[PDB]
């Protein structure tokens, strides 16, 4: 599957997780279509366990209606999405070291907000090209 291909890539690159933020990538993987938002929509993939989607609470319904077989975690407008994403990762027993992101799309401030929630991650991996070629 497309998701298993990403998981495999993640494992082959010795990444603790892949954080997908490009709405075009999320649409490609799920059918959930969207445009750039100020809020936080992400799809987190691990090398050796199930992925999850993190989204604004009101988008959860239409995301689950895609058939997506894995968790969808919502957040409310005044909650801290970065802390909540990190809590999901920490619940899954991951203390991330190398993290892959879509560097061509992800804004610096968002990478940093994510990184601040973890003890010593390394954002030295770019999945932009891999996603481009599938």
mmCIF file of N, CA and C in Angstrom:
data_model
loop_
_atom_site.group_PDB
_atom_site.id
_atom_site.type_symbol
_atom_site.label_atom_id
_atom_site.label_comp_id
_atom_site.label_asym_id
_atom_site.label_seq_id
_atom_site.Cartn_x
_atom_site.Cartn_y
_atom_site.Cartn_z
ATOM 1 N N UNK A 1 0.868 -1.250 0.000
ATOM 2 C CA UNK A 1 0.000 0.000 0.000
ATOM 3 C C UNK A 1 0.888 1.280 0.000
ATOM 4 N N UNK A 2 0.323 2.413 -0.396
ATOM 5 C CA UNK A 2 1.028 3.714 -0.338
ATOM 6 C C UNK A 2 1.589 3.996 1.064
ATOM 7 N N UNK A 3 0.759 3.736 2.079
ATOM 8 C CA UNK A 3 1.208 3.890 3.464
ATOM 9 C C UNK A 3 2.305 2.948 3.836
ATOM 10 N N UNK A 4 2.224 1.692 3.395
ATOM 11 C CA UNK A 4 3.354 0.765 3.654
ATOM 12 C C UNK A 4 4.652 1.174 2.923
ATOM 13 N N UNK A 5 4.548 1.738 1.718
ATOM 14 C CA UNK A 5 5.689 2.281 1.056
ATOM 15 C C UNK A 5 6.357 3.396 1.866
ATOM 16 N N UNK A 6 5.542 4.278 2.448
ATOM 17 C CA UNK A 6 6.125 5.336 3.296
ATOM 18 C C UNK A 6 6.722 4.795 4.557
ATOM 19 N N UNK A 7 6.050 3.820 5.153
ATOM 20 C CA UNK A 7 6.610 3.200 6.331
ATOM 21 C C UNK A 7 7.953 2.571 6.023
ATOM 22 N N UNK A 8 8.026 1.909 4.874
ATOM 23 C CA UNK A 8 9.262 1.248 4.487
ATOM 24 C C UNK A 8 10.407 2.256 4.298
ATOM 25 N N UNK A 9 10.075 3.360 3.641
ATOM 26 C CA UNK A 9 11.031 4.441 3.385
ATOM 27 C C UNK A 9 11.549 4.971 4.713
ATOM 28 N N UNK A 10 10.599 5.175 5.631
ATOM 29 C CA UNK A 10 10.929 5.684 6.968
ATOM 30 C C UNK A 10 11.944 4.735 7.665
ATOM 31 N N UNK A 11 11.650 3.450 7.641
ATOM 32 C CA UNK A 11 12.559 2.457 8.237
ATOM 33 C C UNK A 11 13.907 2.381 7.544
ATOM 34 N N UNK A 12 13.903 2.426 6.222
ATOM 35 C CA UNK A 12 15.136 2.427 5.457
ATOM 36 C C UNK A 12 16.041 3.624 5.688
ATOM 37 N N UNK A 13 15.455 4.752 6.077
ATOM 38 C CA UNK A 13 16.181 5.955 6.416
ATOM 39 C C UNK A 13 16.446 6.107 7.901
ATOM 40 N N UNK A 14 16.128 5.087 8.677
ATOM 41 C CA UNK A 14 16.459 5.054 10.086
ATOM 42 C C UNK A 14 15.761 6.233 10.802
ATOM 43 N N UNK A 15 14.580 6.581 10.322
ATOM 44 C CA UNK A 15 13.780 7.653 10.905
ATOM 45 C C UNK A 15 12.867 7.089 11.985
ATOM 46 N N UNK A 16 12.735 7.813 13.082
ATOM 47 C CA UNK A 16 11.782 7.475 14.077
ATOM 48 C C UNK A 16 10.337 7.644 13.639
ATOM 49 N N UNK A 17 10.144 8.616 12.764
ATOM 50 C CA UNK A 17 8.800 8.890 12.242
ATOM 51 C C UNK A 17 8.963 9.815 11.068
ATOM 52 N N UNK A 18 7.911 9.836 10.248
ATOM 53 C CA UNK A 18 7.733 10.787 9.159
ATOM 54 C C UNK A 18 6.512 11.638 9.468
ATOM 55 N N UNK A 19 6.662 12.957 9.366
ATOM 56 C CA UNK A 19 5.569 13.911 9.639
ATOM 57 C C UNK A 19 5.187 14.510 8.320
ATOM 58 N N UNK A 20 4.008 14.175 7.782
ATOM 59 C CA UNK A 20 3.498 14.686 6.484
ATOM 60 C C UNK A 20 2.531 15.836 6.762
ATOM 61 N N UNK A 21 2.803 16.948 6.099
ATOM 62 C CA UNK A 21 2.039 18.203 6.278
ATOM 63 C C UNK A 21 1.483 18.766 4.994
ATOM 64 N N UNK A 22 1.927 18.296 3.830
ATOM 65 C CA UNK A 22 1.506 18.880 2.560
ATOM 66 C C UNK A 22 0.070 18.429 2.287
ATOM 67 N N UNK A 23 -0.880 19.383 2.177
ATOM 68 C CA UNK A 23 -2.257 18.915 1.951
ATOM 69 C C UNK A 23 -2.356 18.056 0.673
ATOM 70 N N UNK A 24 -1.545 18.325 -0.329
ATOM 71 C CA UNK A 24 -1.559 17.489 -1.579
ATOM 72 C C UNK A 24 -1.117 16.083 -1.282
ATOM 73 N N UNK A 25 -0.129 15.903 -0.393
ATOM 74 C CA UNK A 25 0.286 14.571 -0.014
ATOM 75 C C UNK A 25 -0.804 13.864 0.778
ATOM 76 N N UNK A 26 -1.435 14.554 1.727
ATOM 77 C CA UNK A 26 -2.495 13.959 2.513
ATOM 78 C C UNK A 26 -3.681 13.554 1.617
ATOM 79 N N UNK A 27 -3.975 14.392 0.651
ATOM 80 C CA UNK A 27 -5.066 14.050 -0.310
ATOM 81 C C UNK A 27 -4.665 12.823 -1.103
ATOM 82 N N UNK A 28 -3.442 12.781 -1.562
ATOM 83 C CA UNK A 28 -2.965 11.618 -2.343
ATOM 84 C C UNK A 28 -3.080 10.320 -1.536
ATOM 85 N N UNK A 29 -2.826 10.373 -0.250
ATOM 86 C CA UNK A 29 -2.809 9.174 0.591
ATOM 87 C C UNK A 29 -4.185 8.798 1.149
ATOM 88 N N UNK A 30 -5.069 9.769 1.245
ATOM 89 C CA UNK A 30 -6.385 9.538 1.886
ATOM 90 C C UNK A 30 -7.617 9.931 1.063
ATOM 91 N N UNK A 31 -7.479 10.746 0.024
ATOM 92 C CA UNK A 31 -8.654 11.342 -0.611
ATOM 93 C C UNK A 31 -9.271 12.554 0.066
ATOM 94 N N UNK A 32 -8.667 12.962 1.207
ATOM 95 C CA UNK A 32 -9.172 14.128 1.921
ATOM 96 C C UNK A 32 -8.530 15.349 1.304
ATOM 97 N N UNK A 33 -9.336 16.186 0.686
ATOM 98 C CA UNK A 33 -8.811 17.232 -0.145
ATOM 99 C C UNK A 33 -8.824 18.498 0.656
ATOM 100 N N UNK A 34 -7.719 19.247 0.584
ATOM 101 C CA UNK A 34 -7.663 20.531 1.290
ATOM 102 C C UNK A 34 -6.631 21.523 0.761
ATOM 103 N N UNK A 35 -6.722 22.721 1.313
ATOM 104 C CA UNK A 35 -5.961 23.872 0.864
ATOM 105 C C UNK A 35 -5.156 24.286 2.083
ATOM 106 N N UNK A 36 -4.139 25.142 1.899
ATOM 107 C CA UNK A 36 -3.336 25.594 3.050
ATOM 108 C C UNK A 36 -4.227 26.226 4.100
ATOM 109 N N UNK A 37 -4.026 25.852 5.353
ATOM 110 C CA UNK A 37 -4.804 26.369 6.460
ATOM 111 C C UNK A 37 -3.846 26.957 7.516
ATOM 112 N N UNK A 38 -4.391 27.852 8.342
ATOM 113 C CA UNK A 38 -3.595 28.291 9.474
ATOM 114 C C UNK A 38 -3.536 27.181 10.519
ATOM 115 N N UNK A 39 -4.565 26.339 10.608
ATOM 116 C CA UNK A 39 -4.557 25.269 11.590
ATOM 117 C C UNK A 39 -3.641 24.097 11.184
ATOM 118 N N UNK A 40 -3.610 23.072 12.007
ATOM 119 C CA UNK A 40 -2.612 22.020 11.874
ATOM 120 C C UNK A 40 -3.303 20.733 11.437
ATOM 121 N N UNK A 41 -2.937 20.228 10.264
ATOM 122 C CA UNK A 41 -3.372 18.942 9.716
ATOM 123 C C UNK A 41 -2.117 18.145 9.385
ATOM 124 N N UNK A 42 -2.008 16.949 9.928
ATOM 125 C CA UNK A 42 -0.792 16.153 9.698
ATOM 126 C C UNK A 42 -1.124 14.705 9.619
ATOM 127 N N UNK A 43 -0.252 13.971 8.955
ATOM 128 C CA UNK A 43 -0.325 12.514 8.877
ATOM 129 C C UNK A 43 1.037 11.978 9.317
ATOM 130 N N UNK A 44 1.077 11.227 10.401
ATOM 131 C CA UNK A 44 2.313 10.759 11.023
ATOM 132 C C UNK A 44 2.470 9.293 10.770
ATOM 133 N N UNK A 45 3.612 8.938 10.211
ATOM 134 C CA UNK A 45 3.886 7.568 9.796
ATOM 135 C C UNK A 45 5.139 7.067 10.578
ATOM 136 N N UNK A 46 5.067 5.807 11.049
ATOM 137 C CA UNK A 46 6.143 5.198 11.803
ATOM 138 C C UNK A 46 6.708 4.054 11.019
ATOM 139 N N UNK A 47 7.920 3.672 11.381
ATOM 140 C CA UNK A 47 8.547 2.588 10.612
ATOM 141 C C UNK A 47 7.997 1.217 10.930
ATOM 142 N N UNK A 48 7.397 1.082 12.102
ATOM 143 C CA UNK A 48 7.070 -0.240 12.623
ATOM 144 C C UNK A 48 5.751 -0.319 13.388
ATOM 145 N N UNK A 49 4.855 0.633 13.136
ATOM 146 C CA UNK A 49 3.554 0.641 13.805
ATOM 147 C C UNK A 49 2.618 1.541 13.035
ATOM 148 N N UNK A 50 1.349 1.539 13.400
ATOM 149 C CA UNK A 50 0.318 2.189 12.652
ATOM 150 C C UNK A 50 0.458 3.726 12.686
ATOM 151 N N UNK A 51 0.028 4.336 11.575
ATOM 152 C CA UNK A 51 0.055 5.804 11.491
ATOM 153 C C UNK A 51 -1.148 6.427 12.185
ATOM 154 N N UNK A 52 -1.187 7.750 12.221
ATOM 155 C CA UNK A 52 -2.377 8.459 12.654
ATOM 156 C C UNK A 52 -2.459 9.775 11.897
ATOM 157 N N UNK A 53 -3.647 10.338 11.834
ATOM 158 C CA UNK A 53 -3.879 11.683 11.334
ATOM 159 C C UNK A 53 -4.217 12.585 12.518
ATOM 160 N N UNK A 54 -3.740 13.831 12.477
ATOM 161 C CA UNK A 54 -4.042 14.853 13.476
ATOM 162 C C UNK A 54 -4.651 16.032 12.744
ATOM 163 N N UNK A 55 -5.813 16.535 13.194
ATOM 164 C CA UNK A 55 -6.562 17.500 12.466
ATOM 165 C C UNK A 55 -7.365 18.384 13.354
ATOM 166 N N UNK A 56 -7.849 19.530 12.853
ATOM 167 C CA UNK A 56 -8.855 20.290 13.606
ATOM 168 C C UNK A 56 -10.080 19.432 13.844
ATOM 169 N N UNK A 57 -10.679 19.580 15.028
ATOM 170 C CA UNK A 57 -11.811 18.767 15.441
ATOM 171 C C UNK A 57 -12.940 18.701 14.409
ATOM 172 N N UNK A 58 -13.210 19.797 13.744
ATOM 173 C CA UNK A 58 -14.310 19.792 12.794
ATOM 174 C C UNK A 58 -14.000 19.090 11.496
ATOM 175 N N UNK A 59 -12.723 18.837 11.205
ATOM 176 C CA UNK A 59 -12.380 18.120 10.004
ATOM 177 C C UNK A 59 -12.388 16.603 10.245
ATOM 178 N N UNK A 60 -12.408 16.140 11.497
ATOM 179 C CA UNK A 60 -12.291 14.729 11.802
ATOM 180 C C UNK A 60 -13.315 13.881 11.079
ATOM 181 N N UNK A 61 -14.541 14.370 11.074
ATOM 182 C CA UNK A 61 -15.632 13.602 10.420
ATOM 183 C C UNK A 61 -15.353 13.282 8.977
ATOM 184 N N UNK A 62 -15.100 14.313 8.172
ATOM 185 C CA UNK A 62 -14.875 14.106 6.764
ATOM 186 C C UNK A 62 -13.599 13.283 6.535
ATOM 187 N N UNK A 63 -12.580 13.431 7.377
ATOM 188 C CA UNK A 63 -11.381 12.528 7.308
ATOM 189 C C UNK A 63 -11.749 11.049 7.560
ATOM 190 N N UNK A 64 -12.519 10.786 8.618
ATOM 191 C CA UNK A 64 -12.907 9.399 8.849
ATOM 192 C C UNK A 64 -13.810 8.828 7.735
ATOM 193 N N UNK A 65 -14.615 9.676 7.095
ATOM 194 C CA UNK A 65 -15.465 9.247 6.000
ATOM 195 C C UNK A 65 -14.718 8.838 4.753
ATOM 196 N N UNK A 66 -13.414 9.085 4.729
ATOM 197 C CA UNK A 66 -12.610 8.588 3.609
ATOM 198 C C UNK A 66 -12.343 7.086 3.633
ATOM 199 N N UNK A 67 -12.613 6.447 4.764
ATOM 200 C CA UNK A 67 -12.256 5.054 4.957
ATOM 201 C C UNK A 67 -10.975 4.817 5.714
ATOM 202 N N UNK A 68 -10.316 5.909 6.112
ATOM 203 C CA UNK A 68 -9.023 5.836 6.694
ATOM 204 C C UNK A 68 -9.223 4.948 7.900
ATOM 205 N N UNK A 69 -8.369 3.926 7.950
ATOM 206 C CA UNK A 69 -8.494 2.790 8.859
ATOM 207 C C UNK A 69 -7.785 2.981 10.186
ATOM 208 N N UNK A 70 -7.135 4.143 10.351
ATOM 209 C CA UNK A 70 -6.321 4.343 11.511
ATOM 210 C C UNK A 70 -6.829 5.536 12.296
ATOM 211 N N UNK A 71 -6.235 5.779 13.481
ATOM 212 C CA UNK A 71 -6.758 6.888 14.279
ATOM 213 C C UNK A 71 -6.721 8.281 13.621
ATOM 214 N N UNK A 72 -7.726 9.058 13.955
ATOM 215 C CA UNK A 72 -7.808 10.478 13.644
ATOM 216 C C UNK A 72 -8.052 11.223 14.929
ATOM 217 N N UNK A 73 -7.125 12.096 15.293
ATOM 218 C CA UNK A 73 -7.101 12.798 16.523
ATOM 219 C C UNK A 73 -7.393 14.253 16.245
ATOM 220 N N UNK A 74 -8.409 14.786 16.881
ATOM 221 C CA UNK A 74 -8.740 16.164 16.696
ATOM 222 C C UNK A 74 -8.303 17.079 17.794
ATOM 223 N N UNK A 75 -8.252 18.334 17.454
ATOM 224 C CA UNK A 75 -7.963 19.370 18.441
ATOM 225 C C UNK A 75 -8.869 20.541 18.265
ATOM 226 N N UNK A 76 -9.162 21.194 19.406
ATOM 227 C CA UNK A 76 -10.017 22.384 19.438
ATOM 228 C C UNK A 76 -9.195 23.632 19.291
ATOM 229 N N UNK A 77 -9.859 24.720 18.888
ATOM 230 C CA UNK A 77 -9.201 25.914 18.343
ATOM 231 C C UNK A 77 -8.194 26.538 19.311
ATOM 232 N N UNK A 78 -8.423 26.366 20.621
ATOM 233 C CA UNK A 78 -7.568 27.012 21.606
ATOM 234 C C UNK A 78 -6.598 26.037 22.305
ATOM 235 N N UNK A 79 -6.612 24.783 21.882
ATOM 236 C CA UNK A 79 -5.670 23.781 22.393
ATOM 237 C C UNK A 79 -4.300 23.933 21.699
ATOM 238 N N UNK A 80 -3.227 23.354 22.264
ATOM 239 C CA UNK A 80 -1.890 23.399 21.666
ATOM 240 C C UNK A 80 -1.682 22.152 20.774
ATOM 241 N N UNK A 81 -1.741 22.310 19.444
ATOM 242 C CA UNK A 81 -1.693 21.139 18.591
ATOM 243 C C UNK A 81 -0.345 20.426 18.645
ATOM 244 N N UNK A 82 0.741 21.179 18.864
ATOM 245 C CA UNK A 82 2.047 20.597 18.884
ATOM 246 C C UNK A 82 2.255 19.667 20.080
ATOM 247 N N UNK A 83 1.765 20.130 21.233
ATOM 248 C CA UNK A 83 1.840 19.309 22.439
ATOM 249 C C UNK A 83 0.996 18.082 22.289
ATOM 250 N N UNK A 84 -0.159 18.230 21.662
ATOM 251 C CA UNK A 84 -1.042 17.086 21.479
ATOM 252 C C UNK A 84 -0.493 16.075 20.485
ATOM 253 N N UNK A 85 0.130 16.525 19.398
ATOM 254 C CA UNK A 85 0.775 15.611 18.476
ATOM 255 C C UNK A 85 1.878 14.890 19.191
ATOM 256 N N UNK A 86 2.664 15.641 19.955
ATOM 257 C CA UNK A 86 3.789 15.023 20.649
ATOM 258 C C UNK A 86 3.278 13.995 21.665
ATOM 259 N N UNK A 87 2.166 14.298 22.360
ATOM 260 C CA UNK A 87 1.590 13.353 23.288
ATOM 261 C C UNK A 87 1.205 12.052 22.565
ATOM 262 N N UNK A 88 0.631 12.147 21.364
ATOM 263 C CA UNK A 88 0.284 10.963 20.567
ATOM 264 C C UNK A 88 1.537 10.132 20.261
ATOM 265 N N UNK A 89 2.635 10.801 19.914
ATOM 266 C CA UNK A 89 3.893 10.123 19.615
ATOM 267 C C UNK A 89 4.464 9.462 20.879
ATOM 268 N N UNK A 90 4.466 10.206 21.974
ATOM 269 C CA UNK A 90 4.923 9.678 23.258
ATOM 270 C C UNK A 90 4.069 8.491 23.755
ATOM 271 N N UNK A 91 2.761 8.497 23.502
ATOM 272 C CA UNK A 91 1.867 7.357 23.843
ATOM 273 C C UNK A 91 2.213 6.103 23.075
ATOM 274 N N UNK A 92 2.839 6.287 21.895
ATOM 275 C CA UNK A 92 3.190 5.207 21.003
ATOM 276 C C UNK A 92 4.636 4.765 21.257
ATOM 277 N N UNK A 93 5.182 5.222 22.373
ATOM 278 C CA UNK A 93 6.509 4.811 22.854
ATOM 279 C C UNK A 93 7.639 5.211 21.953
ATOM 280 N N UNK A 94 7.492 6.368 21.297
ATOM 281 C CA UNK A 94 8.506 6.901 20.434
ATOM 282 C C UNK A 94 9.079 8.163 21.025
ATOM 283 N N UNK A 95 10.400 8.175 21.198
ATOM 284 C CA UNK A 95 11.139 9.373 21.572
ATOM 285 C C UNK A 95 11.935 9.679 20.338
ATOM 286 N N UNK A 96 11.421 10.585 19.479
ATOM 287 C CA UNK A 96 12.014 10.645 18.136
ATOM 288 C C UNK A 96 13.416 11.179 18.049
ATOM 289 N N UNK A 97 14.210 10.498 17.252
ATOM 290 C CA UNK A 97 15.544 10.975 16.929
ATOM 291 C C UNK A 97 15.467 11.557 15.533
ATOM 292 N N UNK A 98 15.806 10.839 14.477
ATOM 293 C CA UNK A 98 15.669 11.387 13.145
ATOM 294 C C UNK A 98 14.214 11.435 12.752
ATOM 295 N N UNK A 99 13.748 12.607 12.309
ATOM 296 C CA UNK A 99 12.380 12.847 11.852
ATOM 297 C C UNK A 99 12.397 13.333 10.419
ATOM 298 N N UNK A 100 11.638 12.704 9.527
ATOM 299 C CA UNK A 100 11.507 13.147 8.155
ATOM 300 C C UNK A 100 10.294 14.056 8.036
ATOM 301 N N UNK A 101 10.478 15.116 7.262
ATOM 302 C CA UNK A 101 9.415 16.093 6.979
ATOM 303 C C UNK A 101 9.403 16.382 5.463
ATOM 304 N N UNK A 102 8.396 17.070 4.978
ATOM 305 C CA UNK A 102 8.272 17.513 3.606
ATOM 306 C C UNK A 102 8.819 18.939 3.603
ATOM 307 N N UNK A 103 10.120 19.046 3.439
ATOM 308 C CA UNK A 103 10.790 20.332 3.638
ATOM 309 C C UNK A 103 10.431 21.358 2.602
ATOM 310 N N UNK A 104 10.029 20.967 1.396
ATOM 311 C CA UNK A 104 9.619 21.934 0.403
ATOM 312 C C UNK A 104 8.363 22.685 0.739
ATOM 313 N N UNK A 105 7.548 22.151 1.630
ATOM 314 C CA UNK A 105 6.260 22.736 2.008
ATOM 315 C C UNK A 105 6.235 23.214 3.457
ATOM 316 N N UNK A 106 6.832 22.509 4.399
ATOM 317 C CA UNK A 106 6.629 22.799 5.831
ATOM 318 C C UNK A 106 7.333 24.101 6.183
ATOM 319 N N UNK A 107 6.647 24.985 6.866
ATOM 320 C CA UNK A 107 7.204 26.234 7.304
ATOM 321 C C UNK A 107 8.132 26.030 8.495
ATOM 322 N N UNK A 108 9.210 26.807 8.539
ATOM 323 C CA UNK A 108 10.222 26.712 9.593
ATOM 324 C C UNK A 108 9.557 26.741 10.970
ATOM 325 N N UNK A 109 8.611 27.690 11.189
ATOM 326 C CA UNK A 109 8.055 27.853 12.529
ATOM 327 C C UNK A 109 7.367 26.575 12.987
ATOM 328 N N UNK A 110 6.771 25.831 12.046
ATOM 329 C CA UNK A 110 6.062 24.638 12.386
ATOM 330 C C UNK A 110 7.015 23.519 12.695
ATOM 331 N N UNK A 111 8.057 23.337 11.875
ATOM 332 C CA UNK A 111 9.106 22.407 12.227
ATOM 333 C C UNK A 111 9.617 22.677 13.615
ATOM 334 N N UNK A 112 9.910 23.921 13.936
ATOM 335 C CA UNK A 112 10.460 24.246 15.254
ATOM 336 C C UNK A 112 9.465 23.978 16.348
ATOM 337 N N UNK A 113 8.198 24.291 16.129
ATOM 338 C CA UNK A 113 7.190 24.053 17.183
ATOM 339 C C UNK A 113 7.064 22.581 17.489
ATOM 340 N N UNK A 114 7.100 21.767 16.482
ATOM 341 C CA UNK A 114 7.114 20.305 16.631
ATOM 342 C C UNK A 114 8.358 19.852 17.354
ATOM 343 N N UNK A 115 9.542 20.315 16.904
ATOM 344 C CA UNK A 115 10.793 19.892 17.492
ATOM 345 C C UNK A 115 10.865 20.235 19.003
ATOM 346 N N UNK A 116 10.330 21.388 19.374
ATOM 347 C CA UNK A 116 10.362 21.848 20.789
ATOM 348 C C UNK A 116 9.690 20.895 21.723
ATOM 349 N N UNK A 117 8.834 20.032 21.247
ATOM 350 C CA UNK A 117 8.074 19.127 22.127
ATOM 351 C C UNK A 117 8.820 17.853 22.455
ATOM 352 N N UNK A 118 9.959 17.617 21.805
ATOM 353 C CA UNK A 118 10.750 16.388 21.931
ATOM 354 C C UNK A 118 12.119 16.657 22.502
ATOM 355 N N UNK A 119 12.757 15.654 23.097
ATOM 356 C CA UNK A 119 13.976 15.985 23.843
ATOM 357 C C UNK A 119 15.161 16.348 22.966
ATOM 358 N N UNK A 120 15.404 15.596 21.902
ATOM 359 C CA UNK A 120 16.529 15.947 21.019
ATOM 360 C C UNK A 120 16.353 15.306 19.660
ATOM 361 N N UNK A 121 15.366 15.768 18.934
ATOM 362 C CA UNK A 121 15.130 15.233 17.581
ATOM 363 C C UNK A 121 16.093 15.841 16.560
ATOM 364 N N UNK A 122 16.190 15.227 15.405
ATOM 365 C CA UNK A 122 17.072 15.683 14.332
ATOM 366 C C UNK A 122 16.279 15.709 13.025
ATOM 367 N N UNK A 123 15.975 16.887 12.489
ATOM 368 C CA UNK A 123 15.172 17.017 11.283
ATOM 369 C C UNK A 123 16.115 17.127 10.093
ATOM 370 N N UNK A 124 16.798 16.020 9.816
ATOM 371 C CA UNK A 124 17.824 15.977 8.790
ATOM 372 C C UNK A 124 17.409 15.091 7.610
ATOM 373 N N UNK A 125 16.127 14.799 7.516
ATOM 374 C CA UNK A 125 15.584 13.948 6.457
ATOM 375 C C UNK A 125 14.431 14.654 5.705
ATOM 376 N N UNK A 126 14.409 14.563 4.384
ATOM 377 C CA UNK A 126 13.452 15.229 3.524
ATOM 378 C C UNK A 126 12.810 14.156 2.683
ATOM 379 N N UNK A 127 11.499 14.004 2.828
ATOM 380 C CA UNK A 127 10.717 13.051 2.038
ATOM 381 C C UNK A 127 10.089 13.683 0.798
ATOM 382 N N UNK A 128 10.404 14.968 0.550
ATOM 383 C CA UNK A 128 9.811 15.704 -0.581
ATOM 384 C C UNK A 128 9.964 14.932 -1.910
ATOM 385 N N UNK A 129 11.196 14.538 -2.230
ATOM 386 C CA UNK A 129 11.474 13.882 -3.496
ATOM 387 C C UNK A 129 10.783 12.512 -3.588
ATOM 388 N N UNK A 130 10.834 11.730 -2.499
ATOM 389 C CA UNK A 130 10.206 10.394 -2.448
ATOM 390 C C UNK A 130 8.662 10.510 -2.739
ATOM 391 N N UNK A 131 8.017 11.474 -2.081
ATOM 392 C CA UNK A 131 6.587 11.687 -2.287
ATOM 393 C C UNK A 131 6.363 12.119 -3.750
ATOM 394 N N UNK A 132 7.217 12.985 -4.288
ATOM 395 C CA UNK A 132 7.099 13.521 -5.670
ATOM 396 C C UNK A 132 7.064 12.356 -6.675
ATOM 397 N N UNK A 133 7.896 11.332 -6.422
ATOM 398 C CA UNK A 133 8.067 10.183 -7.344
ATOM 399 C C UNK A 133 7.088 9.062 -7.190
ATOM 400 N N UNK A 134 6.316 9.038 -6.116
ATOM 401 C CA UNK A 134 5.156 8.177 -6.078
ATOM 402 C C UNK A 134 3.937 9.080 -6.384
#
